[PDB]
Design a binder for this molecule. Structure first.
Ligand SMILES: Nc1ncnc2c1ncn2[C@@H]1O[C@H](COP(=O)(O)OP(=O)(O)OP(=O)(O)O)[C@@H](O)[C@H]1O
Ligand SMILES: [Mg+2]
Lengths: 239, 209, 232, 250, 238, 228, 199
């Protein structure tokens, strides 16, 4: 057994292996999510496809239950083992207390798994950040995120990945109340958001909405070809 | 102080020429590899007389390029080992923020391995501005092809947008490395315009080896 | 007590495992040894010089049998060899207690080289400093395999290990063909060990072991003197 | 004892980690493997390295390893590290068959091994594997599949990929000559001999220098056929006949 | 100094520096003075605080009905040996049905704290135990140190500025083996006014006294019942 | 160059215990005041973004029905100590059929605070206030990353800790009431925080002898603010 | 002790069980449910002692729901039934063997409908019809009397009607009510809770 303290304090009060892992998040591909009052909409950008690969084994939006979706950034090898440990826990909740898992509960499991893992012996911390999105019982759509140090944190709109400060500055000057008016109008905010990011001009973006009673339903590159037309068409006439 | 860092071939040396184009100051350049000497103490003597030259002329600009090379590569000419590299850097650490009256001397530095060198040299007071250079973005890439193919009689066969995403992280240096090479293939056949198959065999020659 | 539980063998920034590259230097400074298979059996021949006249040459042996039909020589350092001999003696028994059959020579090298790879990754250990040559005649056809401290293995027709191994491989390439008997391969194994020995190659400076379909055995110095006679 | 510890698990101050990038640096050199599919069948084209004139040429394969009764793998990197992985997911497929009495799907065999490979990069103070490898196979859920593993622990589905020494040159030409769902298992073979004509610096394409194995679906068989050295060279010269025709007529 | 890192490493002079640095930790805590008569064992502590509204940190603890201790150093390792101290007293009372003798208790501590002073990656216990108790042989004053070396003594003082208290105890210890409980205590109280700056001494909220006695169970006096003992002292001469 | 985690200084303290004392100077500030009428206890939130939901974060959390808490420094490892305190108060109720006192909760946590090493891995970088009403009335305790706890009367912990303590020693006296202790704390928090004071940047909680642990919410809270 | 039945047709599986949760001599609950879903086309019908029928059958249910989330598709009825047989057989030679009797019913899009049979010794059996409990001794003889491999689902219900009326003539237990399912290409469907009025 390898017993060595990896994460230790700095002489001024930092945890260096934590904040080095935050920079591995800061060059993964961008993931943006907002919530509507009835339909949540989150979609990663930079699919970065090379037209010789299977398109389904590269997906970064998975589901933990029927109601809880999840996107991430950072490095993918650490991601899909946190996900598989979350799938066991949200299934073991049902053998216990009968209701399906509330979206706040599954964030506390991931965040507490991630903290104690910056505390044990001989373990580097995880290098991912996540967005947990779900519409729980009694239909209240909400989302969260998870820092690699393990601080779960709710939001109304957020973005992580490479180029996340510029998108977060873009949303606050754009997030109104009437932006979440229609289920097709909230999507026009996300498609306007990631187009203000690394280019992804309809060819590298994959939105995925959830209408509070469905599962995840990814629109194929025909409505995004339709939406990016009309989002740029309104931009064509006003300016 | 101003330092410039980033991956190799992104335009660190390219930007310093634009400053020396523009300025009316006297402009001094030295490479970091030639700071190390074969005799003992000839290193720190060379630094002291550099800033003597820079101060005695004018408002002046001292450009020191590739300063990570003072600490990475060990050479058998240097009789003092790593503890002659060290004594030179202590003199360089003096000449940026000594107690002497400095005068009007601006210092520009550039490297591509920013994590290797001494953090005492990058403290505020010696270098204030720290400028990162990223890789060229794919809409800034198209601008670079517009520059290096400006004054060439480019035939209308070619499509530049296929050339852009060829390497996913091709630097600005690679673009000039292709555009200069494709012109060299045309002079093998005495032609005046550059066709598409020039570029098709160009990236095989430049990138893939 | 306890161990270290961390690998002291890491990747270089040039992408090379440096400790394995150093272990091959200790193999190359060993005693020279050649091995030749030819169409009815395998010949293993090594070079054993005592440092002085005080040593008892009939006490230790370079050529060792593993079972009825598998022999094994080395070229490296001494005390590492006796460890993985006693390991390979045991591995041939757990195959036999399960299957009631002598082990194939291929499946032994599957399991001996798995020990050497496991030993260059685990915590707190330096790799072995020996390379092996393994013979045997399973199901008529003979076999000749060579392992290395990294844990790989090969299937040679004829090869040399030890000092001046790059000269022996050029010598065997100009000598070996498909069609030889066992007594011809003995004569050309002495002819390639004479490239690097001293002036006197007596009946006790070398050590030769053979396989047949009758099984592995090791030559006594009586007939080794007869093979050393009328040689070169 | 903490003076001798090399800390093969920690991050670097720039954010990335050095140890697996040194391994993927070593995965570039020493080997060449590629695969292709568009229709019924899938192939693995691999180039032999040790072509010395004194070897026995046995064990039915050199870098091809049959894993299940209907899937196989081609490996690249440290060969000794490869022998531990190959007989590790060989019994992952068998403990699946013990548990469900059904052959394992080709995708979740890859995810099972790439979790073992990911764990050494993450804790234990242990040297990771410098091994990347391909996966062909068939299952009833999706048919012919093609995967690729990395030493970091992340996999991916593909259609044609090379992990050779000039693998970037091969991929750049695979996405120059390709067709989605129309490359039958003769045009892919002619395309396979075309690609390793380029990336192999040893010219003239010695038939003993390469190995090609095909996986075709026969009704209850899924025949994995390592094609012999008598039909390689006629496929070699078939590439040679058309290239003298195409050069002279252009 | 590369010989200055781990407890295992000997110095070339032969003095392990990690043990010598734990002696610096006991010199940081406030002073305390223990002494004994023929029939009594009295230890007196001096508390400290952080602000004027925060409470004062206690130092005298109750181990058993005939054993009490006083700590100096970091308080977390003090409770680690205190919970070991209480456990070793009541199981001997569970097995043999007798009070565990004091001189046999301290040798269990000396074997307890010597173990992490020899392994790898194990700190010493920075603590300043003054022990007062009863055998069948009368009172006993024992002190320990992080070098796992316990001392039999008749009056000692440890903590910050304790050398001035030791000079007072040497020139008055001929009187200690005769007096009753009253001026035995205020002999020790004149040692704590020695180890202070010349303006504040004994303001009834920073001092504590613990006595075990020949027919008296170990009793701690805190900040109100100190005042009968504390009255009857003369002014500081200047 | 690299020491172990368990090394004394030449001045004798430690290295990483003393480094963790520095880490709680980056956390948000928090004020607790003990009054004989009851314990009031407040904090700021340090809201970063307008898009952020404000109530998802918390600093006041309850341990039992009569004991509240307040955390500073890091947050993610504070939740480990909170869960050990909640379990400890329920094991004491299960085995003794009573309520664990406020002091004995604190030493049950403070024994856990210094247990790292290389067997069986770093000290916790939080600082806690424990407000509660046991049978000795209202109590107020303060622990350390070093595991040292002491009863305080008006303790201010966070990035503005030493600036607030000086302004808090002048207004506190032993005969306060709870209605003026609540008002006196928000005068101090109005000075030290960055943004303006409203009903969303801060939150309070008071524990009484009569009723149990009560946390204020955004309806009864702003009558203190508009009548500051 | 209590009864369930397994008629399997060409493109459907008709299953039914009782609804009585028993006690010493009384019946605690008259509308109990012995039916456990795992997928959209796989059921589970468990009979045995008190604790093991509840906890084993929901242990299997959390492993089948987990397989669908990790992969995106469901188990076949062949593989789902054969995963259960490994779990009894491994826990058989233990300190706590489960004592349950069960039969699993499933539909697949490749091999059509399927019915499997198990006991408390974990022996599989691919059967066209099966039954557990003491009512199996009474009711198997009617069922092979009238079984056709090509039987329509309308007359398969009235065969089950005939198979239960004899169970309320010569069987000493009470058993008034019976809950009925049906499985097809469209998934699980609830049929009429057939019963006999004791008024
Ligand atoms: N962003 C750019 N726009 C236009 N040209 C560029 C750009 N980046 C690089 N180039 C071309 O690349 C050539 C070399 O660039 P330069 O040497 O300045 O990069 P560098 O980062 O300084 O290289 P090094 O890291 O080796 O010092 C220049 O002559 C320039 O023409
Ligand atoms: Mg340059």
């Amino acid at each position: 057994s390898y017993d060595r303290a990896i994460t230790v304090f700095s002489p001024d009060g930092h945890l260096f292996q934590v904040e080095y892992a935050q920079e591995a998040v800061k060059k993964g591909s961008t993931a943006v999510g907002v919530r509507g009052r009835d339909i949540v909409v989150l979609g990663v950008e930079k699919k970065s496809v090379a037209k010789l690969q299977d398109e389904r084994t590269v997906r970064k939006i998975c589901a933990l239950d029927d109601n809880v979706c999840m996107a991430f950034a950072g490095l993918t090898a650490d991601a899909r083992i946190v996900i598989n440990r979350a799938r066991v826990e949200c299934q073991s909740h049902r053998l216990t207390v009968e209701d399906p898992v509330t979206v706040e509960y599954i964030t506390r499991y991931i965040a507490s798994l991630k903290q104690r893992y910056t505390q044990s012996n001989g373990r580097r911390p995880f290098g991912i950040s996540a967005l947990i999105v779900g519409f729980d019982f009694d239909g209240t759509p909400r989302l969260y995120q998870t820092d690699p140090s393990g601080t779960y944190h709710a939001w109304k709109a957020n973005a992580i990945g490479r180029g996340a400060k510029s998108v977060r500055e873009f949303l606050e000057k754009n997030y109104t109340d009437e932006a979440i008016e229609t289920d097709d109008l909230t999507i026009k905010l996300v498609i306007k958001a990631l187009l203000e990011v690394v280019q992804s001009g309809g060819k590298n973006i994959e939105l995925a909405v959830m209408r509070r009673d469905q599962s995840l339903k990814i629109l194929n590159p025909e409505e995004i070809e339709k939406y990016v037309a009309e989002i740029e068409k309104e931009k064509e006439e006003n300016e | 102080g101003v330092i410039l860092y980033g991956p190799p071939g992104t335009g660190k040396t390219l930007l310093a020429k634009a400053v020396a184009n523009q300025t009316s100051a006297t402009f001094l350049r030295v490479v970091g590899s030639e700071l190390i000497q074969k005799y003992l103490g000839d290193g720190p003597k060379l630094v002291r007389e550099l800033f003597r030259v820079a101060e005695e002329h004018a408002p002046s600009i001292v450009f020191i390029d590739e300063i990570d090379a003072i600490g990475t590569k060990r050479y058998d000419s240097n009789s003092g080992g790593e503890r002659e590299i060290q004594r030179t850097m202590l003199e360089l650490l003096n000449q940026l923020d000594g107690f002497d009256s400095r005068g009007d001397v601006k210092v520009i530095m550039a490297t591509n391995r920013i994590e290797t060198l001494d953090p005492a040299l990058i403290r505020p007071g010696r270098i204030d501005r720290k400028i990162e250079f990223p890789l060229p973005d794919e809409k800034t890439k198209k601008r670079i092809f517009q520059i290096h193919t400006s004054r060439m009689t480019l035939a209308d066969d070619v499509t530049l947008d296929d050339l852009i995403m060829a390497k996913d992280d091709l630097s600005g240096a690679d673009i000039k490395a292709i555009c200069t090479e494709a012109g060299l293939m045309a002079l093998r056949e005495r032609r005046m315009k550059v066709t598409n198959e020039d570029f098709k065999k160009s990236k095989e020659n430049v990138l893939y080896k | 007590e306890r161990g270290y539980s961390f690998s002291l063998t890491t990747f270089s920034p040039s992408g090379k495992l440096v400790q394995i590259e150093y272990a091959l230097a200790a193999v190359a400074g060993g005693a020279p040894s050649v091995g030749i298979k030819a169409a009815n059996g395998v010949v293993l021949a090594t070079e054993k010089k005592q440092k002085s006249i005080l040593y008892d040459e009939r006490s230790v042996h370079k050529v060792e049998p593993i079972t009825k039909h598998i022999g094994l020589v080395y070229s490296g350092m001494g005390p590492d060899y006796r460890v993985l001999v006693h390991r390979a003696r045991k591995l041939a028994q757990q195959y036999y207690l399960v299957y009631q059959e002598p082990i194939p020579t291929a499946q032994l090298v599957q399991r001996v080289a798995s020990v050497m790879q496991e030993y260059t990754q685990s915590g707190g250990v330096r790799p072995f400093g020996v390379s092996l040559l393994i013979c045997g005649w399973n199901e008529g056809r003979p076999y000749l395999f060579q392992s290395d401290p990294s844990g790989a293995y090969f299937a040679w027709k004829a090869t040399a290990m030890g000092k001046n191994y790059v000269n022996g491989k050029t010598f065997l390439e100009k000598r070996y063909n498909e069609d030889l008997e066992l007594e011809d391969a003995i004569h050309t194994a002495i002819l390639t060990l004479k490239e690097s020995f001293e002036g006197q190659m007596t009946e006790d400076n070398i050590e030769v072991g053979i396989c047949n379909e009758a099984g592995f055995r090791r030559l006594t110095p009586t007939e080794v003197k007869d093979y050393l006679a009328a040689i070169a | 004892s903490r003076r001798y510890d090399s800390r093969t698990t920690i991050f670097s101050p720039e954010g990335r980690l050095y140890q697996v990038e040194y391994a993927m640096e070593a995965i570039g050199h020493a080997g060449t493997c590629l695969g292709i599919l568009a229709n019924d069948g899938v192939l693995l084209a691999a180039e032999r390295r040790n072509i010395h004139k004194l070897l026995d040429e046995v064990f039915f394969s050199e870098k091809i390893y049959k894993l299940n009764e209907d899937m196989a793998c081609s490996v690249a990197g440290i060969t000794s590290d490869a022998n531990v992985l190959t007989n590790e997911l060989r019994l992952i497929a068998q403990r699946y068959l013990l548990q469900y009495q059904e052959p394992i799907p080709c995708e979740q065999l890859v995810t099972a091994l790439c979790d073992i490979k990911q764990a050494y990069t993450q804790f234990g103070g242990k040297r990771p594997f410098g091994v990347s490898l391909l996966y062909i196979g068939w299952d009833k859920h999706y048919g012919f599949q093609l995967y690729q593993s990395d030493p970091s622990g992340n996999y991916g589905g593909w259609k044609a990929t090379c992990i050779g020494n000039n693998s970037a040159a091969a991929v750049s030409m695979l996405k120059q000559d390709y067709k989605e769902g129309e490359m039958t298992l003769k045009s892919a073979l002619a395309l396979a001999i075309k690609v390793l004509n380029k990336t192999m610096d040893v010219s003239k394409l010695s038939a003993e220098k390469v190995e090609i194995a095909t996986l075709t679906r026969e009704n209850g068989k899924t025949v994995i056929r390592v094609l012999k050295q008598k039909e390689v060279e006629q496929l070699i010269k078939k590439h040679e006949e058309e290239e003298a025709k195409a050069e002279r007529e252009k | 100094n590369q010989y200055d890192n781990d407890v295992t490493v000997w110095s070339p002079q032969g003095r392990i520096h990690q043990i010598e640095y734990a002696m610096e930790a006991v010199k940081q805590g406030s002073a305390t003075v223990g002494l004994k008569s023929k029939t009594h064992a009295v230890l007196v502590a001096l508390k400290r605080a952080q602000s004027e509204l925060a409470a004062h940190q206690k130092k005298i603890l109750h181990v058993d009905n005939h054993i009490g201790i006083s700590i100096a150093g970091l308080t977390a390792d003090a409770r680690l040996l205190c919970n070991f101290m209480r456990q070793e007293c009541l199981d001997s009372r569970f097995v043999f049905d007798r009070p565990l003798p004091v001189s046999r208790l301290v040798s269990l501590i000396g074997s307890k704290t010597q173990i992490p002073t020899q392994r790898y990656g194990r700190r010493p216990y920075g603590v300043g135990l003054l022990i007062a108790g009863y055998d069948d042989m009368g009172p006993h004053i024992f002190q320990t140190c992080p070098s796992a070396n316990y001392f039999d003594c008749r009056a000692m003082s440890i903590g910050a500025r304790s050398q001035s208290a030791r000079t007072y105890l040497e020139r008055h210890m001929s009187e200690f083996m005769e007096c009753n409980l009253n001026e035995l205590v205020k002999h020790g109280l004149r040692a704590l006014r020695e180890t202070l700056p010349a303006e504040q001494d004994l303001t009834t909220k920073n001092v504590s006294i613990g006595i075990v006695g020949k027919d008296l169970e170990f009793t701690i006096y805190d900040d109100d019942d100190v005042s009968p003992f504390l009255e009857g002292l003369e002014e500081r001469p200047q | 160059y690299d020491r172990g985690v368990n090394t004394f200084s030449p001045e004798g303290r430690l290295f990483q215990v003393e480094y963790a004392i520095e880490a709680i100077k980056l956390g948000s500030t928090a004020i607790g005041i003990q009054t004989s009428e009851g314990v009031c206890l407040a904090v700021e939130k340090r809201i970063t973004s307008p898009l952020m939901e404000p109530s998802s974060i918390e600093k006041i959390v309850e341990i039992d029905a009569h004991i509240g808490c307040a955390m500073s420094g890091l947050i993610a490892d504070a939740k480990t100590l909170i869960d050990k305190a909640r379990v400890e108060t329920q094991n004491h109720w299960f085995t003794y059929n009573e309520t664990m006192t406020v002091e004995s909760v604190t030493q049950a946590v403070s024994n856990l605070a210094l247990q790292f090493g290389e067997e069986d891995s770093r000290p916790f970088g939080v600082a806690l206030l424990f407000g509660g009403v046991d049978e000795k009335g209202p109590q107020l305790f303060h622990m350390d990353p070093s595991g040292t706890f002491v009863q305080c009367d008006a303790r201010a912990i966070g990035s503005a800790s030493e600036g607030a303590q000086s302004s808090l020693q002048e207004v506190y006296h032993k005969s306060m009431t709870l209605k003026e202790a609540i008002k006196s704390s928000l005068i101090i928090l109005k000075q030290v925080m960055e943004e303006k004071l409203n009903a969303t940047n801060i939150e309070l909680a008071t524990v009484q002898p009569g009723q149990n642990f009560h946390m204020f919410t955004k309806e009864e809270l702003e009558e203190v603010i508009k009548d500051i | 002790m209590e009864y369930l039945i397994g008629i399997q047709g060409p493109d459907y599986v008709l299953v039914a069980s009782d609804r009585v949760a028993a006690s010493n001599i009384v019946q605690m609950k008259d509308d109990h449910d012995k039916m456990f879903k795992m997928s959209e086309k796989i059921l589970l019908l468990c009979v045995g002692e008190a604790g093991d029928t509840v906890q084993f059958a929901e242990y299997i249910q959390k492993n089948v729901q987990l397989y669908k989330m990790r992969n995106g598709y469901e188990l076949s009825p062949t593989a789902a039934a054969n995963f259960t047989r490994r779990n009894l057989a491994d826990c058989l030679r233990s300190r706590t063997p489960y004592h349950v009797n069960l039969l699993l019913a499933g539909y697949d899009e490749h091999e059509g409908p399927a019915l499997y049979y198990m006991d408390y010794l974990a022996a599989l059996a691919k059967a066209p019809f099966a039954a557990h409990g003491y009512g199996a001794f009474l009711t198997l003889s009617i069922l092979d009397r009238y079984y056709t491999p090509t039987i329509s689902r309308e007359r398969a219900v009235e065969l089950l009607r005939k198979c239960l009326e004899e169970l309320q003539k010569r069987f000493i237990l009470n058993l008034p009510t019976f809950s009925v399912r049906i499985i097809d290409k469209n998934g699980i469907h609830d049929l009429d809770n057939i019963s006999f009025p004791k008024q």
